[PDB]
Amino acid sequence: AAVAGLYGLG
Amino acid sequence: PQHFEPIPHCERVVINVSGLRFETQLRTLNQFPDTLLGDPARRLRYFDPLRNEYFFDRSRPSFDAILYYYQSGGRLRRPVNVPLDVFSEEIKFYELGDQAINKFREDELFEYPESSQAARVVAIISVFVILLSIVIFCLETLPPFFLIETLCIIWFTFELTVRFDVMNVIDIIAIIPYFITSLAILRVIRLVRVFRIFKLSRHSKGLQILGRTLKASMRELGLLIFFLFIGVVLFSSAVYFAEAGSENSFFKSIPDAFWWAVVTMTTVGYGDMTPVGVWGKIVGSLCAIAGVLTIALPVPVIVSNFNYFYHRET
Amino acid sequence: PQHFEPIPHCERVVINVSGLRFETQLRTLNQFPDTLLGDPARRLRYFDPLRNEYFFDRSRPSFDAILYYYQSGGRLRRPVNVPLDVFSEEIKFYELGDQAINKFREDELFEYPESSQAARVVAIISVFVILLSIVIFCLETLPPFFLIETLCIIWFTFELTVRFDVMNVIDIIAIIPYFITSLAILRVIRLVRVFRIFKLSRHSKGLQILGRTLKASMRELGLLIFFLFIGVVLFSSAVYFAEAGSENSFFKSIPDAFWWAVVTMTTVGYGDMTPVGVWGKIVGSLCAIAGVLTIALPVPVIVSNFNYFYHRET
Amino acid sequence: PQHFEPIPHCERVVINVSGLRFETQLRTLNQFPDTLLGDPARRLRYFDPLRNEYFFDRSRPSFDAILYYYQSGGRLRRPVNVPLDVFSEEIKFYELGDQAINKFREDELFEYPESSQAARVVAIISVFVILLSIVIFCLETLPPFFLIETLCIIWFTFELTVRFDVMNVIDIIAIIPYFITSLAILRVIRLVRVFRIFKLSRHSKGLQILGRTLKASMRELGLLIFFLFIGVVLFSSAVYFAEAGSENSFFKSIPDAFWWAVVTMTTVGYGDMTPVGVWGKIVGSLCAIAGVLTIALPVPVIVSNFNYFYHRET
Amino acid sequence: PQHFEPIPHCERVVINVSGLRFETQLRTLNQFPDTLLGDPARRLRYFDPLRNEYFFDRSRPSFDAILYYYQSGGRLRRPVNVPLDVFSEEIKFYELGDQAINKFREDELFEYPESSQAARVVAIISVFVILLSIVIFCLETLPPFFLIETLCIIWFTFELTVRFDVMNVIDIIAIIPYFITSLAILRVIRLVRVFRIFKLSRHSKGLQILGRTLKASMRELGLLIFFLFIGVVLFSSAVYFAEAGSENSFFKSIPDAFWWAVVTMTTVGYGDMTPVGVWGKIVGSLCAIAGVLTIALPVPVIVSNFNYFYHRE
Amino acid sequence: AAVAGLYGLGK
Ligand SMILES: [K+]
Ligand SMILES: [K+]
């Protein structure tokens, strides 16, 4: 989904 | 978000991970105190006095990120070559620090509420009471029920009291119409009486996931509403000005065409469509296409958020 | 879900995989008896006596998990760097354990049903008879057929007896109405007579895939039904209470508005909509938007499951 | 699907690719004759007589698959760590063989049609003529045209003769109704006259992409049609048997309800829906839900194929 | 799009990146001047005089891409094993040159518009004025307003002259009908007066993202329109010729069936459908299926573009 | 109106 975990958590 | 990195010119040491040799400056290891590699007290056990090397019979692919933590001076991230469990097992062994481990994880009576002590019955009883209250409400709106409603409200008040947060707000809302009991005030309180259906959020997990998704995508919901507002205004104005040139006008005004524009954008369907002329039909076709596009645009983000929350929960 | 790892202090050995050197002491290999590396008997052939070094002329990127399987003491997790075929042969070559291989599989007369020995004609006849029975059913519902139905039923019974599971249940069901033959019971049996269409699951592969997907998505289906139920109840209540202030009420009661709520949530379209006032129209727009969102939320999980099952089958 | 791998007991050599040392025996090299490494003639240049090493100043991560060709004896998959261009040059350098490159590639006058020689004017004229023919048709069906139709057919047959494959089949079909010209036969030929619109496949690229996707998605198209057929039959039977218990029968027979089932499953909308009772409304709600699910099931295969073809073309 | 690779026969040097040894020709290093490795002056400090090697205490997994730039002689691309920030730091560490890093970035008064200096109040006032103008327009179309419309136009033109792309074009358009003020011309100007709703593009970021997505998906929009046109024509012809065999013909002509074809393709719903016979119903079912398919086809490209732009912004 | 919001993955 997100390559670098963009906008992960909050 | 900013970190410090070692600078070169003393003594260079070699670290062996199951045959993979790593050469690092002692200054790089000394940046982070404590830890296995940070201090020599807990490195003598793994140090080889013969070959002058430190041996760690572990997984070789995971040592690059662990070493890079010293190299980056604070930046720790799991490379996409290994599962989460294998990376997790590594960090405790090297003991990167409680502040480092938990921060990395972020990157990844009163018996009633709990579902145990064989009191699950209480939860089942509450769910049955909620369903019964919904059924009695719907049947009361049909062309007695007051006693059952009183019993349901008594149970709701007792449950809220023994518990005594959005769930608490819903619980307190569920009884305000009953304790309260112009015609507009009566109409609105009878309407807000329906919020008893939201009391299922305590017991249902999918409802909680949906609520979390709605909370986490407020910007996306606002953008979707904004796009629908722009579309309905534009297309209602277009169709009204297209059909203003006829003696018998299907749409009396732009606000009258808001419903037609909304149902065409959403592809619900207005119904009868014959009296509208050719220009109105062209505007309606454009409105349908634009509605499909503008509703298919922002929904995927909410869908992905819901999927992520559901997978995290399960 | 717990595994053990060798701890440091005996003798260390070196493993060579196409030039890539691996260092590991004997206790890690001694953790797993048998296998190519666990016992010395099956590894002395690949040992080089002059260099005191084990040589393995194999692929270097796939050996990392092989060593980690010994390192992790049972946790054999595939690395995503290679195709499945190369990793399949690598584990067999080391004979890491017959029981060990099995868990990796899920980690990644009576001549009638088997479509061979020319039994393909017997199948074709079964499909033709099923289609003929469906056609005769639809035709007898139009404003003789009894003989054709009798032939279809006797063929079904003969097939069931020859074969003598959900398919078996469907086959038994397909003849129960005919063997049976208040008005309600007659209507029920006539309705359940349609279950003959499900007999195509034996021959159709896509129908089997759909059935497996439905079996594997029961939670998703339940969540979808729950969301639609909540939305329908809420919006029916909203529209009924919005229209309760008019002399000519389009909706007599909340249950009366259930059909309108369902068709608006599913975007099917109610049809005639003019008598509804402005508040009802606002509630309808909100219902349409919420229905689009609610339908869009849990579908791309059943969709993914169906795609996975279809690709696995094909 | 099967290949042979070298087995040990003679002579072994080392390959040094910019510091990444690879050690393989000559038997592995000798399995593939020719090539850069198969014969000593074309690999002696890179050989270093001083260190007895083969030096290859190329990219390290791409050599794993190159050695795997010798390792597996005919099996080649690209490792997922490098772009396609990097590996394409890498394999071409070692000249694995024309059959090898082709295998890897598959695993990942008459001046009229060729749009050059500033004949693009011919293509523009053809597109304009096709559009004019479509317009002439759509206005000749309204409540002279024959001359323009004759001119369009003359241009079509001239282009066909000059050019003289389903596209050629469409070109043949586009003139058959005109050259031909019971009432049913006349209606059929007038209908098949519309296939002039498909002549745009010659010029448009998106139309060709759609045609290729439809050809490559025949299985899921058939599956979608089968699912629609099953759902329509089931729900038509259910609604007919649920509603037939009243004096006023909205549906005369099961075939009568096929259109309603189709529009409900596809969410088009039947329209007026009042006379059907509560059981029919429940059946309709279930039909709408099941139709949404069944039409959402197979289409994320068709769309994926279309996206792949579109990206390949562009 | 063409690059040159070093060809052997003169000296070879070894690079030690945190234990990972690399062997590369000196001519490869000399292909790119300047930089850390291009000249001995900027790399002599990092050199190890006793081991005859260069010791780089940096991230070893990312050195392969750095070496490939010299190996390929002009090609730089990050492999998918490290975050982009790590690679961005590494290339700055070696200082490949701004002439090379520049093409890598895209590989993956006048105080009014700038929302700072306590000017956000001006933006709020502008948004309120735009909303008020839209409301007055919608209300005056109902069965005075002129003064409020004049005030809104005065504010719009004041902002335009104070500030004096496409947003400026929209701002100019928003006052053209007012400054102008056959029946067709009046209808056209009253219709184009609605363009005031597009002035919200200046303030709203999501609407700007939508505009960028529309600009970047013109080919897909055209393909969608073309597919809809083809399907509409085909199914209108089919249904008209199916229902032309009855005295009471529901559709008078193929153009009359265009609306029915559009609503069936888009699954909106024609409404009354009883008089059409069995052949027309079959044609309608086929039209509904084909509409669902042909609309679901080209959408998850506009969707992908919108998602990309939203994540970027 | 908007359930075909698919993506990649699936393998
Ligand atoms: K619809
Ligand atoms: K609809």
CATH number, residue E50: 3.30.710.10
Chain D CA closest to residue F2: D296
The tokens describing B271, both together, are 């119904």
Query: Are the C-beta atoms of B238 and E194 separated by less than 8 Å?
Result: yes
Report yes or no on E139 lying in a domain.
yes
Residue F8, chain C, CB below 8 Å: the answer is no
- Cα three-residue angle C121-C123-C127, rounded to 5 degrees: 115
> What CATH code is carried by the domain that includes residue D242?
1.10.287.70
Q: Is residue E183, in this structure, part of any structural domain at all?
A: yes
Question: Tell me, what DSSP letter sits at residue C190?
Answer: H
* Same-domain pairing of D172 and D225: no
- D282 within a domain of the structure (yes/no): yes
* Dist CA C261 CA C259 (whole Å): 5
Rg of the Cα trace of chain B? 32
Residue at token pair 């040392």: D21
Q: Residue C62: exposed, middle, or buried by beta-carbon count in 10 A (0-12, 13-18, 19+)?
A: buried
| C113 within some domain | no
In a domain, D314, yes or no: no
Give the C-alpha distances (Å, rounded to integers) separating D179 from D153, D200, D283. Answer: 9, 21, 51
Q: Does A6 touch chain B (CB under 8 A)?
A: no
Phi, psi angles (nearest 5°) of residue C201: -65, -30
Tell me if there are at least 3 CB pairs under 8 Å linking chains D and A.
no
How many secondary structure helices (H) and strands (E) does chain D include?
Answer: 14, 4
Last residue in a domain, options B75, B107, B139:
B107
Q: Identify residue D37 by its one-letter amino acid code.
A: L
Q: Which strand (E) or helix (H) includes residue D153?
A: helix D145-163
Specify whether the CB–CB gap between E239 and E306 falls below 8 A. no
Helix (H) or strand (E) holding C56: strand C53-56
Give the total residue count for chain D: 314
- Among D179, D203, D227, the domain boundary falls at D203
Q: Say if the Cβ atoms of E83 and A4 lie within 8 Å.
A: yes
D259, D269, D314 member nearest E269 (Cβ): D269
| DSSP state for residue C181 in the 8-state scheme | -
Backbone angles phi, psi at B60, to 5 degrees: -60, -40
Q: How far apart are CA C190 and CA C186, in angstroms?
A: 6
CB of E247 within 8 A of CB of E255?
A: no
E53, E74, E105 - which closes a domain? E105
The chains found to touch D (3+ Cβ pairs under 8 angstroms) are B, C, E, F
Tokens of E249: 């013909």
CA–CA separation, E37 and E40 (whole Å): 7
Same domain, B134 and B73: no
| Whole-number Å distance between alpha carbons of C120 and C203 | 10
Alpha-carbon distance C143 to D184, whole Å? 26
Is residue B18 located within the same domain as residue B103? yes
Structural tokens at position E206: 């999501």
Q: Chain F residues with CB inside 8 Å of D299's CB?
A: 4
Q: Ligand 1: distance of its center to the CA of E263 in Å?
A: 9
Q: How far separated are the first and last CA of chain C, in Å rounded?
A: 32
Does E211 fall in a domain? Answer: no
Instruction: Let me know: does B265 contact B224? Beta carbons within 8 Å.
Output: no
Neighbours of chain F (3+ CB pairs under 8 A): B, C, D, E
E196 with E234, same domain: the answer is no
Asked if D119 and D163 touch (Cβ cutoff 8 Å), the reply is no
In a domain, D161, yes or no: yes
Distance from CA of C77 to the nearest CA of F (A): 17
CA separation (Å) from D202 to C163, D21, D133, E230, E232? 55, 55, 16, 15, 20
Classify D54 as helix, strand or coil.
Answer: strand
Residue with tokens 């559709």: E251
How far is residue B46's CA from residue E239's CA, in Å, rounded to a whole number?
Answer: 82
Angle at E303 between CA E287 and CA E265, to 5 degrees: 10
Tell me whether residue E41 is in a domain.
yes
Domain shared by B36 and B78, yes or no: yes
How far is the C-alpha of C224 from the C-alpha of C222, rounded, in Å? 5
- C197 and C147 within one domain: yes
Measured CA to CA, the distance from residue E265 to residue E261 in angstroms comes to 6
The answer to whether residues E261 and E182 belong to one domain is no
Q: Which 3-state string (H, E, C) describes D5-51?
A: CCCCCCCEEEEEECCEEEEEEHHHHHCCCCCCCCCHHHCCCCEECCC
Element (H, E) at B121: helix B120-140
User: Does E79 touch chain C if contact means CB atoms closer than 8 Å?
Assistant: no
Contact criterion met (CB below 8 Å) for D293 and C302: yes
Residue in the structure block whose two tokens are 């300047």: E34
- B187 and B158 in a common domain: yes
Determine the residue among B217, B264, B303 to mutate to test chain F binding: the one whose Cβ has the most chain F Cβ atoms within 10 Å.
B303
> Which ranges of D217-298 does DSSP label H, i.e. alpha helix?
218-243, 258-265, 278-296
Name the residue of chain F whose CA is nearest to D266's CA.
Answer: F1
Same domain, E266 and E233: yes
Rounded Cα distance between E32 and D269, Å, is 68
Residues 6+ positions from D239 with CB-CB distance below 8 Å: D251, D257, D260, D261, D276, D280, D283, D284, D287
Interface of C with D in 233-262 (CB under 8 A): 258-259, 262
Please tell me whether residues D130 and D52 are part of one structural domain: no
Q: Which of D247, D298, D239 is nearest to D264 (CA)?
A: D239
Give the C-alpha separation, C264 to C266, whole Å. Answer: 5
CA distances from B140 to B171, B181, C256 (A): 21, 15, 13
Query: What are the distances in angstroms from CA E155 to CA E125, E127, E145, E149, E174?
Result: 10, 11, 15, 10, 11
- C111: which 2 tokens? 């001549």
Alpha carbons E198 and E194: distance in angstroms, whole number = 8
Gap between the Cα atoms of E252 and E190, Å rounded:
33
Q: How many CA atoms lie within 13 A of D23 on its CB side?
A: 14
Distances (CA, A) of D225 to D218, D221, D295: 10, 6, 9
Residues listed for chain C: 314
Distance (Å) from the alpha carbon of D184 to chain C's nearest alpha carbon:
25
Residue of C74, C87, C79, C86 lying closest to C38 (CA atoms):
C74
Q: Which residues contact D302 (CB under 8 A, 6 or more apart)?
A: D213, D217, D220, D221, E293, E296, E297
Long-range contacts of C82-89 (CB under 8 A, 24+ apart): C82/D77, C82/D79, C83/D77, C84/C108, C85/D75, C86/C59, C86/C62, C86/D68, C86/D72, C86/D75, C86/D77, C87/C62
For helices C205-216 and C218-243, the axis angle rounded to 10 degrees is 70
Question: Cβ–Cβ of B300/E303 closer than 8 Å?
Answer: yes
Taking only residues 99 to 118 of chain B, the set having a beta carbon closer than 8 angstroms to any beta carbon of chain A reads 106-107
SS (H, E, C) C211-238: HHHHHHCHHHHHHHHHHHHHHHHHHHHH
Q: Is D34 left (phi over 0), alpha (psi -120 to 50) or beta?
A: left
| Torsion, CA E237, CA E241, CA E244, CA E246, rounded to 10 | -130
For residue B266, the enclosing domain spans 218-309
Amino acid of residue C154: I
Q: Which ligand is nearest to the CA of C270?
A: 2
With both helix axes pointing from N to C terminus, report the angle between B218-243 and B205-216 in degrees, rounded to the nearest 10: 70
Number of domain units in chain D: 3
Question: How far apart (Å, rounded) are the C-alpha atoms in residues B17 and C307?
Answer: 41
In sequence order, which residues have a C-beta less than 8 Å from that of residue D51 and are 6 or more positions away? D16
Sign of CA dihedral B287, B292, B295, B298: negative
CB-based contact, F5 to chain C, within 8 Å: yes
For tokens 């590494």, name the residue: E90
Backbone angles phi, psi at B197, to 5 degrees: -65, -25
